[PDB]
Amino acid sequence: GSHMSWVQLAGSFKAAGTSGLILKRCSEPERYCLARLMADALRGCVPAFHGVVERDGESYLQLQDLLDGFDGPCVLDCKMGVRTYLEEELTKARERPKLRKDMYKKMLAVDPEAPTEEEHAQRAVTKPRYMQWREGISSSTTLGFRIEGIKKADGSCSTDFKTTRSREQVLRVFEEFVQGDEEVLRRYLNRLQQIRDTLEVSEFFRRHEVIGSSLLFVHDHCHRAGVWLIDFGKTTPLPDGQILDHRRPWEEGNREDGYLLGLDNLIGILASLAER
Ligand SMILES: Nc1ncnc2c1ncn2[C@@H]1O[C@H](COP(=O)(O)OP(=O)(O)OP(=O)(O)O)[C@@H](O)[C@H]1O
Ligand SMILES: O=P(O)(O)O[C@@H]1[C@@H](O)[C@H](OP(=O)(O)O)C[C@@H](O)[C@H]1OP(=O)(O)O
Ligand SMILES: [Mn+2]
Numbered sequence: 589g590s591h592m593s594w595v596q597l598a599g600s601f602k603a604a605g606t607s608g609l610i611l612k613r614c615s616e617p618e619r620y621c622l623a624r625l626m627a628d629a630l631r632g633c634v635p636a637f638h639g640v641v642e643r644d645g646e647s648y649l650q651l652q653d654l655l656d657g658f659d660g661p662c663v664l665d666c667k668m669g670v671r672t673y674l675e676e677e678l679t680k681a682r683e684r685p686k687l688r689k690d691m692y693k694k695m696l697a698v699d700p701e702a703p704t705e706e707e708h709a710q711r712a713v714t715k716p717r718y719m720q721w722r723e724g725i726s727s728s729t730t731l732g733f734r735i736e737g738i739k740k741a742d743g744s745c746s747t748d749f750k751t752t753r754s755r756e757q758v759l760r761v762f763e764e765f766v767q768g769d770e771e772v773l774r775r776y777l778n779r780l781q782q783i784r785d786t787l788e789v790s791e792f793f794r795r796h797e798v799i800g801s802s803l804l805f806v807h808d809h810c811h812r813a814g815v816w817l818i819d820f821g822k823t824t825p826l827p828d829g830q831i832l833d834h835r836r837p838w839e840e841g842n843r844e845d846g847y848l849l850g851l852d853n854l855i856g857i858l859a860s861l862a863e864r
């Protein structure tokens with residue numbers, strides 16, 4: 589049905605006046621990206637962007653509500669890429685470190701031996717250090733994606749995936765998500781194959797570093813299944829006609845995100861599940 593229906597039964601999102609739409613707090617990087625994407629090969633792989641609206645003295649993206657076509661949708665959010673922070677965060681952490689006390693807490697909780705003696709003394713870590721740690725205990729570093737959350741239309745949700753890392757651990761999350769619906773799994777795989785094909789020919793994709801975006805998997809008990817790319821808040825244009833392959837390893841300077849390494853692995857796991 590609608591994401592704000594789920595929000596109410598359970599941020600940056602607000603109910604839209606028009607049926608089938610949702611509002612997201614406007615950010616300049618994401619507005620720029622959605623405008624380019626409506627004219628790109630990837631047009632059909634992202635939510636429709638209808639422009640910006642003002643609601644209580646604040647700018648919102650008018651987006652397609654991806655849940656609108658579905659009867660009580662199941663949603664899985666997959667964060668894509670081997671790297672999940674911009675390179676400029678590394679520069680800022682060196683010259684002008686913003687110590688994050690919150691990120692220290694989240695880290696200790698998962699692994700008490702993870703922080704350094706100095707981080708323990710600071711009770712605080714830099715964003716890049718926190719994000720690099722998150723990448724390594726999840727599947728991000730090795731597979732180039734990670735499961736972030738699952739939501740169901742009753743309000744039922746889980747974000748308990750921070751140590752979901754191995755190929756087989758990831759497969760078991762998708763296995764439980766699709767609940768033996770062969771039609772949903774087949775439609776997901778067909779959609780991911782067509783998405784990969786579109787990304788490989790996209791003018792937008794070859795010219796942009798795609799960081800912190802997700803693949804949103806949506807299905808219902810009527811066996812309807814869709815997948816879309818979302819969240820272009822950290823997607824940045826490459827300088828002066830530079831391009832990425834989105835598969836080669838990230839080395840500070842080269843701006844590689846491993847997006848397609850992730851997608852390749854995600855397709856392989858779903859193809860493996862389908863043969864189980
Ligand atoms: N167009 C959409 N239609 C329906 N639901 C959406 C849409 N965009 C986002 N959502 C929902 O909102 C969640 C958060 O989306 P998104 O990542 O764009 O926002 P965010 O505020 O940057 O969140 P995060 O900090 O987790 O990255 C998604 O996982 C999904 O459940
Ligand atoms: O907004 P801050 O806290 O600076 O960063 C969050 C980070 O706290 C979060 O960690 P957890 O997912 O909570 O472990 C992962 C991302 O949502 C990240 O947001 P960006 O993707 O960088 O915009
Ligand atoms: Mn996001």
Ligand SMILES: [Mn+2]
Binds near residue numbers: 800819821
């Ligand atoms: Mn985000």
